[model samples]
Target: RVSHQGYSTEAEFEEPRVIDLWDLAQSANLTDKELEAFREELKHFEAKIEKHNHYQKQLEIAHEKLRHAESVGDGERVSRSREKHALLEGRTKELGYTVKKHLQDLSGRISRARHNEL
Candidate 1:
């Protein structure tokens, strides 16, 4: 919209990139302020918190389902539930230690069998 200023649109000057955290904040597109704000948003990253909680809840449900299956002597149910839960637990491990620790904290709050634990 700043045609008078020689800029037609904002996207025109965009430096497409993997914006993990304003990788080129100082590029000076508009005082680098846009990127600065972008990084600030990334600093919070609340969008993922809800997603994390949602999946964490799913994991807890799976674990609880397996527990119930075990108590009810449902071999097929236990196997199926354990298979699903195992996929998550294995991923929790493969996701590396830092994420594992964070998810384990969530697990402590959500899970019963300590699946996220060592």
Candidate 2:
């Protein structure tokens, strides 16, 4: 399992049966129900990644803007940039919380499967 951000396992489907189903779904074109479920999961996964990336970029931009504003001695710009930075910080925290929740959900599911097999 490839861990992402030290959270997700490197192998999304460690179980061979799950991996086989995933591969079959991809290769054979899943039914509407399966496809819809996969699409929704994929969307959520992608959104989580995108949001994290965007949050990081926003943080970088805010930092740079603040530095430039301070260098130019523009108090107003600095203040505004600071506000933006705060906003980004809040967003980053929220996204982090969401990501953690998702990761924990995945972990719980995996654990449940293991227990069921036992």
Candidate 3:
């Protein structure tokens, strides 16, 4: 029943505007110290995004199985699949918030830095 080996470590999914900051920093000529600060945040965000995507994939599969289990009237599989879907869904939501918060905070800081250079 195992169709997948595991989540990939590759950048199959792109983290949003977090990467945009790299270009913005270059254009704005941000300071090394300042860039480093954003870099730190970026690193953490990227890793989190990686995890977020993996969970998303898992959630998708869990949902598919759940639906199938329901159609087939499999109580044990239904409950198991439903529980897994809930767990992965919760994690995906949790990671989503942190990702949003991180980007929001970084954008503010980077925006200020960019404006200061003008």
Candidate 4:
């Protein structure tokens, strides 16, 4: 099982640091053109994350049903469940690939912005 923060304690998990894109651009002294390119890349990453999350939810639901089918010993139902699971698995993999690609692209843009600022 994945360990979630604050599940066993009253204390909250560590908060993530928030960086304003505009502030980052100013601090990095990025040209307006570079800033615009960065923003576009950031948007791509955000969209990819959203799509990945949607597929993940679907995969989870399909997995739950698959487990239920196995417990009930319904062969037909189990077969259908397995097929659905396979379809979702394929889609999830595609989404994961897209998300990874966008993240790498974004990282490259961030690195360029930092170097330009320097």
Off by over 4 Å in 3: 1-18, 22-28, 114-118
**Residue range 1-118, candidate 4, lDDT tens digits:** 1121333221121112212343364446677666766667556655655555555566677677888889999899889888877776676666656655654565456556654422
So what's the TM-score on candidate 4? 0.59
Candidate 2 local lDDT, residue 61: 70
For candidate 2, the lDDT comes to 0.57
Summing lDDT over every window of 10 consecutive residues in candidate 4, give the lowest-scoring window: 9-18
Q: Which lDDT tens digits does candidate 1 get at residues 36-99?
A: 5544553443344333334445667787687888999979988888887777655444443444
Ranking the candidates on TM-score from highest down gives: 3, 4, 2, 1
**Candidate 3 accuracy as TM-score:** 0.72
lDDT (Cα, tens digit) per residue for candidate 2, span 87-114: 8777667766765576566445433433
TM-score for each candidate, following the candidate numbering: 0.41, 0.59, 0.72, 0.59
Give the CA lDDT, 0 to 100, for residue 9 in model 2: 14
For model 2, the superposed segments whose C-alpha errors exceed 4 Å read 1-38, 110-118
Best by TM-score: 3
**Residue 91 C-alpha lDDT in model 2:** 69
All candidates' lDDT scores? 0.45, 0.57, 0.65, 0.55
| Predicted structure 4: lDDT | 0.55
Q: Rank the candidates by lDDT, best first.
A: 3, 2, 4, 1
Off by over 4 Å in 4: 1-29, 114-118
Q: Return the clash pairs for model 2, or none.
A: 1-9, 1-10, 1-11, 2-9, 2-10, 2-11, 3-10
